[PDB]
Structure 1
Amino acid sequence: GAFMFTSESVGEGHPDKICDQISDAVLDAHLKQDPNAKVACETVCKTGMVLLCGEITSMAMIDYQRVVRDTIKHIGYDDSAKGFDFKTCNVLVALEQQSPEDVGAGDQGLMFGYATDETEECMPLTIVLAHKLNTRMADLRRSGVLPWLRPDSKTQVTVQYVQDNGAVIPVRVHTIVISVQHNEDITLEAMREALKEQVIKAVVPAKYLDEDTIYHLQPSGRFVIGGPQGDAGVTGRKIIVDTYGGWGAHGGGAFSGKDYTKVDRSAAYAARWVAKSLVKAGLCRRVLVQVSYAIGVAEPLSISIFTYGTSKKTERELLEVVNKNFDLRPGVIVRDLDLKKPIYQKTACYGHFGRSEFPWEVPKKLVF
């Protein structure tokens, strides 16, 4: 039942993602010394000018200059011409820091969860490829293989699909668009060549690459001193690339900068968890689990499972499976998913869903 789809992703150097990372870096920095630290911060950046804002109630001694500059360094901003230098950039900290199982969900909410068997990650091929494309470039950057590669990048992958008396089977990569920052001493011809052979063909399965697949490598020509500038970088502004690439559903809640007590993060992770578990357990080929919460109440206020006719069990057979295998109460979620652990920075880029190294990406058994 043909149709096409497109998704995008950005590198660690993208202004918005730098802020997402810095904000989560500050979250990690607090969890390490106080796993109960209450973090609620965000970052704003603009050409060698980083603004750390926020309200965090914690009892840990943190050097914000250090955690911000280290994060910028990690990203690869050490030289001047790159558009950022951790040693010279302005780090204005306007942060306010205080000191002092059946909890109960804060703020009326509605979290979504999604999973599909089109890839081993249980995530849409389009967004998976988009992320992996950026990931590979960072590897080649950090390894030395492609030393002209700079932190800021953007990726878009559009794949042609076809339904299947259930749902969504990828056929081929229609077109790929990739833009990456770079050093001056490297020709546009050499860049485009390296992008096709060393990054694209090294990550995209042969089955999907074609003789007609369209490539748009460095479309706008050069992107040298571009760096994290844009016109400004912000936290929580890359909401779709952090999730499913526009495939599931999204209520609008941002992740980065918020601790594990905010249902926007925790419950979203939990919802992904059950979704991935369901498909992995063969109970369906594609699911859209919807978990609702009521302010004050701990136990979820109605969970809905949305298969697209890919399950044999039947919604409200699968719900009992979820109700017998999962305890989606906020407090239990953080305990079961080990959400007090400082893993948030690595979650701040290349997508929150898909990578198996995260607790919520490990499928639960599911006793049926």
Structure 2
Amino acid sequence: GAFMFTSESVGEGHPDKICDQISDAVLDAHLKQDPNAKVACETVCKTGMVLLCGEITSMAMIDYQRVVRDTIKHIGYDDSAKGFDFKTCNVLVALEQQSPEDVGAGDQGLMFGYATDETEECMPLTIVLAHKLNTRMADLRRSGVLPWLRPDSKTQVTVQYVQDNGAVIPVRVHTIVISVQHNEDITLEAMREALKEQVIKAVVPAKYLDEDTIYHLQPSGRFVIGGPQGDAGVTGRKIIVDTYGGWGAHGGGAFSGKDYTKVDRSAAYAARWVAKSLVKAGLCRRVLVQVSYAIGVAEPLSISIFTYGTSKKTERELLEVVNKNFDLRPGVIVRDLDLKKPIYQKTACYGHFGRSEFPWEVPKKLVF
């Protein structure tokens, strides 16, 4: 039942993603000394100018200059011409820091969860490839293979699909668009060649690459001193690339900069968890689990499972499977998923869902 889809992703150098990382870096820096630290911060950046804002109630001694500059360094901004230098950029800290199981969900909410068997990650091929494409570029950048490669990049992958008496089966990569920052001493012809052979063909399964597959490598020509500027960088502005690439559903809640007590993050992770567990357990080929919460109440206020006719069990058979295998209460979520651990920075880029190294990405057994 043919249709096509497109998804995107951005590198660690993207203005918005730098803020997402810095914000989560500050979250990590607190969890390491106080796992109960209340973090609520965000970052704004604009050409060698980083503004750290936020309200964080914690009891740990942190050098914000150090955590911000170290994060910028990690990203690859050490030289001037790159559009950012951790040693010279302005780090204005306007941060306010205080000191002092059946909890109860804060703020009325509605979190979504999604999973599909089109890839081993249980994530849309389009977004998976989009992320992996950026990931590979960072590898070649940090390894030395492609020393002209710079931190800021953007990726878009559009794949042609076809339904199947249930749902979504990828057929081939229709077109790929990739833009990456770079050094001056490297020709546009050499860049486009390396992007096709060393990055695209080194991550995209042969089955999907075609003789007609369209490539748009460095479409706008050069992107040298571009760097993280883009008029300004902000936290929580890359909401769709952090999730399913426009495939599931999204209420609008941002992750980065918020601790484990905010249902926007925790519950979203939990919903992904059960979604991935369901398909992994063969109970369905594609699911959209919807978990609702009521302010004050701990136990979820109605969870809905949305298979697209890919399950044999039948919604409200699968719900009991979830109700017998999962305890989606806020407090239990953080305990079961180990959400007091400082893994948030690595979650701030290349997507929150998909990578198996995260607790919520490890499928639960599911006793049926």
Measured against the shorter chain, the TM-score band is over 0.9
Q: Matched residues in 2 for 1:232 and 1:87: separation?
A: 20
Q: What are the Cα deviations for residues 179-215 of structure 1, in whole angstroms up to 9, with x where unaligned?
A: 0000000000000000000000000000000000000
Q: Matched residues in 2 for 1:284 and 1:141: separation?
A: 39
Moved segments of 4+, more than 2 Å? none
**Distance apart, 1:92 and its partner CA:** 0.0
**Distance apart, 1:269 and its partner CA:** 0.0
**Distance apart, 1:286 and its partner CA:** 0.0
**Distance apart, 1:152 and its partner CA:** 0.1
**Distance apart, 1:351 and its partner CA:** 0.0
**Distance apart, 1:177 and its partner CA:** 0.0
Partner of 2:328: 328
1:134 partner SS? helix
Partner of 1:345: 345
**Distance apart, 1:8 and its partner CA:** 0.0
Q: Matched residues in 2 for 1:24 and 1:230: separation?
A: 21
Q: Matched residues in 2 for 1:175 and 1:166: separation?
A: 26
Partner of 1:363: 363
**Distance apart, 1:93 and its partner CA:** 0.0
Q: What are the Cα deviations for residues 265-321 of structure 1, in whole angstroms up to 9, with x where unaligned?
A: 000000000000000000000000000000000000000000000000000000000
**Distance apart, 1:134 and its partner CA:** 0.0
Gaps of 5+ in 2: none
Q: Matched residues in 2 for 1:11 and 1:344: separation?
A: 17
2:80 partner SS? coil
1:261 partner SS? coil
2:290 partner SS? strand
**Distance apart, 1:343 and its partner CA:** 0.1
Q: Matched residues in 2 for 1:112 and 1:60: separation?
A: 33
Q: Matched residues in 2 for 1:365 and 1:168: separation?
A: 25
Q: What are the Cα deviations for residues 38-88 of structure 1, in whole angstroms up to 9, with x where unaligned?
A: 000000000000000000000000000000000000000000000000000
Q: Matched residues in 2 for 1:276 and 1:168: separation?
A: 16
Q: Matched residues in 2 for 1:79 and 1:132: separation?
A: 26
**Distance apart, 1:10 and its partner CA:** 0.1
Q: Matched residues in 2 for 1:341 and 1:289: separation?
A: 25
1:154 partner SS? strand
**Distance apart, 1:221 and its partner CA:** 0.0
**Distance apart, 1:358 and its partner CA:** 0.0
Q: Matched residues in 2 for 1:6 and 1:273: separation?
A: 24
2:65 partner SS? helix
Q: Matched residues in 2 for 1:290 and 1:278: separation?
A: 13
Q: What are the Cα deviations for residues 101-152 of structure 1, in whole angstroms up to 9, with x where unaligned?
A: 0000000000000000000000000000000000000000000000000000
Q: Matched residues in 2 for 1:139 and 1:326: separation?
A: 37
**Distance apart, 1:157 and its partner CA:** 0.0
Q: Matched residues in 2 for 1:355 and 1:23: separation?
A: 20
Query: May I ask how many residue pairs the two structures share in their alignment?
Result: 368
Gaps of 5+ in 1: none
Q: Matched residues in 2 for 1:324 and 1:67: separation?
A: 42
**Distance apart, 1:20 and its partner CA:** 0.0
Q: Matched residues in 2 for 1:83 and 1:282: separation?
A: 48
**Distance apart, 1:13 and its partner CA:** 0.0
Q: Matched residues in 1 for 2:258 and 2:92: separation?
A: 20
Q: Matched residues in 2 for 1:166 and 1:181: separation?
A: 41
Partner of 1:172: 172
Q: Matched residues in 2 for 1:139 and 1:80: separation?
A: 22
